[PDB]
Ligand binder design. Structure first.
Ligand SMILES: [Cu+2]
Ligand SMILES: [Cu+2]
Ligand SMILES: [Cu+2]
Lengths: 100, 390, 390, 390
């Protein structure tokens, strides 16, 4: 269940997302439209650097950045799932207690 | 706009703002004003604030009342984070296209990594027109144009709302097909199994098959439109080039040097008295004409006989005086400077008594016979005088 | 050897590798080749990668096919971590004794603290002999020699296997003396106590007394042999001395200066076109003869009429051209440079379109009439041209 | 006083201490001695110790046997944390008012952020008088004086002890009003409810009303007394100014340059033999007169014919020798220096064999014909000679 949920995320977002990952040249630099939408419509409190998006590493090999992300998101969602199932259960509790 | 509430001492001992200018204090929707200025990165950068190794230039304004078309600092196009070096000055500018009709108070603004926002000066900027008319636009690498105000929003809804409808079908289906109470009761008794069992599971495997299909389709289509695409472009820009003209603190063969040597401000107040051990160091006689704090200007009306164009608010005409006795060249002189104005109190800089560091910061502006401006940095501990009168 | 897969932009904008040489591309077992070169620590060091304040020089090779006998960088013996400063060049070299018969592709390599490995160039190095014959050796402070390949491994086994056997005795003893099912059943019923109770406990206290004894003994013996011993030697080495010759980026009175001013690479590609604002700055006229990226060389066949000794692979003869019009001294000139080669695609540098920072880095080589080489650093945003076709 | 136990190589390769002086080696209670000196921030700062970017100057002494009246370093009044730049020298001094009668061994001390304490030299300091007599005092901004030794302690007890008594009332009240055992048993049976129920709760609501009222009062009062008050003043001080005189390592046109080029100490030991590749670089002939390590002085009795005033302990007269052959100007010479003294061993510096960095650190002191002192920094790997002995 969760492994699917993990994998399908990016795929099912792509359709709405691709449009904004089209490239523009701005003042001799490359930007995606998205970056630019951000840059344009000014947020008082949102300096690029706060972002927490991919910025490259030496241990990336490929061409693989999304597949690994999604498989990882899948495998971890297994654990979250369990815990949250049993918490769904704990929250479904009809236990009545005697005093406060 | 909240600059008033920030800690006084911090505003004074981080970024020193000067020569801030607004192209036009009125624009039409789509008309393209520009805000610019220069900033000196104070030398004794406070502990409270991250090192400005990672910073970001910004237009301080209540949302996108103006689109930003581009901005530059340290002679770089700076839509990403940039390093500022302690002690240097940088020049910047922001290209702002009017968008929303009103009267907005737009600021120069820089944020430091683990520091927060530092707000510069701000000027009211009357915009007129109808927002309806605002466009961008922008040109792709493929050469085509897109109006950003609208581009892509169609395609989004196109994918989002269908699926939300689908999701809502799935719910209302099973709900009205086997109620809540009905199916609770069933389950609560023996069964269950009345509630599900195939071919409820046939419906499921089919609905699922269509979902995945709908995805592989939606993917391959949106992969055909837009078969280019690049990842978000992020990360710290190459080091900036500071200002080298002239001078411009610690730049050039000639310059002024100011030590702070004692201060006192009244509490409550409006007044500050400081003794300044000036050295000069140029080859012209220098009169001190201006002192800037948090974008506040304090002018010697002996030097500023008139009387600059600069938002109220903000701009004082009592940064006085000396004995107008021009000093050098070579001369080393300690000179009592009184700074008095309601703005010092109005801009909560008298609430320096509340701070965990009773310390002043900022730039001093010395002028020659002719125009020539020479800048030196002033800073250090000032003591409060606790006065009566509430 | 995986350098191909690393992020393009990072490989180009971190370490700039040059003059890499391999003493001998063949060795006998015990025969003592050396790998050396120089590296320039790019100026605009990327966010993604730790500052190289902590780094380590290494031979990039599939295990100990060569023992390393020593290595040096920045004029220091560097068997421990060392600082590299952004903007500087360092020269290094690694003394490598053949050990394992084959054909290995050995690299220059440096790793950064929180960055990872940066792989330099690599050359195949045919080793021959029998591994059996490999020795070291090495000399202690007491004066004696030891063959490292073997030293110590006796004494280890001596102490490890006895105790493993002892461990196994202990198990097999209690196992066959009261079985699993037997003792389970005993315990499962009332008792228990049949299973243990002294003098199972006497065996215990004894086996233990011998164990501890065995330890105090083995200790005091191995304390007698080797009564000297020092703790492992670790920590960051004193700062290095960079190269001052000559020049060698930003060193000396004379030099070239290149600004990047616009770039374009084709996608998919083989080609890069860049406009370079060169200034010079020397006192000789300069022709641009080479460009290095990830250890990739791009040569102007006008300047490299022949045609250097350098692993394939890696070494292109299309870093051309100019109008061969030697520029200066004094001259400031912007000059279209085309770089074209299958190696740029083969080393995945065309996968720069995949990266989060579309940006080039590396060294430019200008030459005088005579030999004299003048090095300037080049870097900055290049744009992709999205092309159809194979 | 524990300097002995700290790791040898670390005390040597961090802070290099010189010209430490104590105003008076005797004082009366209230009499105001002063400890001063200079320190050179070693250039190859060990990995083990935080960068000294955040440090703090201190009087190493067993509690407030001397109040500190003030202190200074890098030409600043330094009651807060300060930055020390690697490779520079700073001068400091501490103003120490006697307080407790005895014979204390008082040190110069600096602590680094993520480092720990570094202890300078220490001198015995006989105090006499009766502590009863010790005062401060100190002046408020309002102009009044207060004896610190006593100020405020009154008011404190005044508020604490009453409340503690109140607390103890509350407890003894309920205790003897309804027992432990009684109330346990009541609760244990049906009730409970016998134990509490209003008007036990009337007592509570009242006691609480008084408590809060006791607070609002005590607040308002203590708000009337002292209606001024500022928050604790904290944070890293503006950068220091190093020593520029003269010189003083890497300062001025003239200077000495010492490389280390091999070392050997005996284990166990008292001896150190090092070859030093001196260069000079001044314009006078230089004789090497002193070598300092962890506050330890090693003197050439050829140069120190007499024979300074300096705590024992600590001060050797066998930092010898050369062939007293004054070297330069211009002359570059490699010179075997023997350092031998019981102090080297007594100060556990011979326990360098125990360290994870067998490396030496410190300052060399060359003198001219006349007085003039020239300082150069020595450091790096020294090898142990493992000699027969305990
Ligand atoms: Cu505002
Ligand atoms: Cu390889
Ligand atoms: Cu002591």
């Amino acid at each position: 269940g969760s492994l699917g949920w993990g994998l399908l995320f990016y795929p099912n977002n792509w359709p709405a997302i691709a449009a904004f990952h089209q490239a523009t040249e701005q003042h001799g630099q490359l930007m995606t439209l998205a970056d630019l939408i951000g840059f344009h419509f000014v947020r008082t409190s949102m300096p690029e650097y706060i972002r927490m998006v991919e910025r490259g590493t030496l241990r990336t090999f490929g061409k693989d950045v999304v597949p690994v992300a999604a498989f990882f998101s899948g495998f971890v969602s297994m654990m979250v799932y369990f815990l949250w199932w049993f918490m769904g259960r704990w929250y479904s509790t009809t236990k009545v207690i005697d005093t406060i | 706009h909240g600059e008033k509430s920030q800690q006084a001492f911090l505003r004074m001992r981080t970024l020193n703002w000067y020569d801030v200018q607004w192209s036009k204090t009125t624009v039409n929707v789509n008309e393209e004003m520009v805000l610019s200025g220069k900033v000196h990165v104070f030398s004794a950068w406070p502990q409270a604030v991250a090192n400005p190794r990672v910073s970001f230039l910004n237009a301080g304004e209540p949302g996108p009342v103006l689109v930003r078309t581009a901005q530059f600092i340290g002679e770089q196009f700076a839509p990403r984070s940039v390093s500022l070096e302690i002690g240097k000055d940088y020049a910047f500018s922001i290209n702002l296209r009017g968008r929303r009709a009103g009267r907005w108070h737009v600021h120069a603004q820089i944020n430091v990594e683990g520091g927060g926002p530092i707000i510069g000066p701000g000027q009211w900027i009357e915009i007129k027109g109808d927002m309806k008319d605002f466009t961008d636009p922008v040109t792709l690498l493929d050469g085509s144009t897109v109006d950003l105000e609208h581009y892509g929003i169609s395609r989004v809804y196109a994918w989002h709302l269908p699926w939300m409808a689908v999701g809502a079908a799935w719910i209302f289906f099973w709900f009205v097909r086997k109620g809540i109470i009905t199916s609770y009761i069933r389950v609560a008794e023996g069964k269950a199994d009345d509630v599900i069992g195939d071919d409820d599971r046939r419906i499921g495997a089919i609905v699922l098959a269509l979902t995945i299909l709908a995805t592989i389709v939606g993917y391959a289509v949106t992969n055909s439109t837009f078969p280019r695409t690049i990842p978000l472009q992020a990360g710290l820009q190459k080091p900036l080039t500071p200002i080298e003209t002239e001078g411009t603190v610690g730049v050039g063969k000639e310059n002024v040097t100011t030590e702070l040597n004692g201060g006192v401000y009244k509490v409550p107040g409006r007044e500050l008295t400081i003794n300044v051990k000036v050295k000069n160091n140029t080859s012209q006689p220098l009169r001190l004409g201006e002192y800037t704090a948090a974008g506040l200007r304090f002018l010697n009306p002996d030097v500023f006989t008139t009387k600059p164009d600069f938002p109220d608010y903000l701009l004082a005409d009592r940064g006085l005086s000396v004995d107008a006795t021009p000093i050098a060249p070579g001369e080393a002189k300690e000179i009592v400077v009184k700074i008095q104005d309601a703005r010092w109190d109005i801009e909560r800089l008298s609430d320096l008594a509340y701070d965990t560091d009773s310390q002043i910061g900022g730039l001093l502006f010395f002028f020659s016979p002719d125009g020539k401006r020479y800048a030196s940095e002033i800073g250090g501990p000032v003591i409060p005088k606790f006065v009566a009168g509430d």
